[PDB]
Design a binder for this molecule. Structure first.
Ligand SMILES: C[C@@H]1O[C@H](O)[C@H](O)[C@H](O)[C@H]1O
Ligand SMILES: C[C@@H]1O[C@H](O)[C@H](O)[C@H](O)[C@H]1O
Ligand code: NI
Ligand code: NI
Lengths: 160, 161
């Protein structure tokens, strides 16, 4: 079980970006935080709650804290985890309405994004990566606004 | 002369919009029933705000309140954008007041400047804001507010007197 104390920059940081360039084989685990997974390139086997997914560029996964998942049989798998703590979000967006897997396992954890969706996600995530400093005034609020933009754009662009 | 949000905003639901002045023609003294941020991208002119004259050029930033009376008295290929907004229509629970001089009343200091970095980041966000605030696709209104919030925080971060 991965702990937010080990993955977030402080107790008040609500969102962070964990780059996996590449994602190597990773053991079955749960979390005490949630995460969005976006696959940028390569492929691999994502096993989510005992269900195997052959994942590839354009795949989007919504993961809840209590989901157990792993990565195996990877091939230059390039992804990003956008990790977040629901209880730390302050903005009044309807997070639960826009994020499958916000309060429990997603009904549908797996989605896809087209070129436009990936372009917008790339742009927002790049800015979000830059807002990680816990010393720059209100960087955490700026990061939450960008996470909000990412969440809306994913809802706008995603498909089954 | 008083400019009305009914004329400058697309709908009653729009909280923020972007009005391009490429360039800004001479414009008579006026008030509004909405607020605006003014960012100057290039050229130069004269901006008279509550009867105080400002020679303006690239890098100038003004926080304008609805009740402010202002004009552009002279202009020389003056290129700017107005980010117009209605405080009463903003739905996001941001501390808008803390980041925007001129939010509830005329600003104590309406005039700031931005350097190269701030201008580049402001231009990127405004370009996105212009798109979102002018379309009717899913979550456009939400995106416009989120982008306006990002802009306002970036300005707060980079502006100086
Ligand atoms: C944050 C953590 O990072 C790991 O490398 C792996 O990708 C996990 O799925 C994720 O929960
Ligand atoms: C919205 C309006 O647009 C005008 O061209 C002028 O720039 C005014 O200052 C502004 O209030
Ligand atoms: Ni995980
Ligand atoms: Ni005006």
């Amino acid at each position: 079980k991965l702990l937010k104390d080990d993955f977030f920059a402080s107790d008040q940081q609500a969102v962070a970006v964990a780059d996996r360039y590449p994602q190597d084989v990773f053991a079955e685990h749960t979390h005490d935080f949630c995460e969005l997974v976006i696959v940028w390139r390569g492929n691999g086997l994502h096993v989510l709650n005992d269900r195997p997914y052959r994942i590839t560029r354009g795949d989007l996964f919504y993961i809840h804290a209590d989901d157990k998942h792993s990565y195996a049989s990877v091939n230059d798998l390039v992804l990003q985890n956008i990790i977040y703590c629901p209880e730390r979000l302050k903005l009044n967006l309807d997070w639960q309405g826009a994020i499958p897997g916000f309060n429990a396992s997603a009904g549908q954890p797996h989605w896809r994004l087209g070129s436009m969706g990936m372009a917008q996600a790339r742009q927002v995530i790049g800015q979000l990566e830059h807002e990680s400093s816990q010393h720059v005034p209100f960087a955490n609020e700026m990061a939450e606004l960008l996470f909000g933009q990412l969440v809306m754009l994913l809802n706008r662009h995603r498909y089954t």
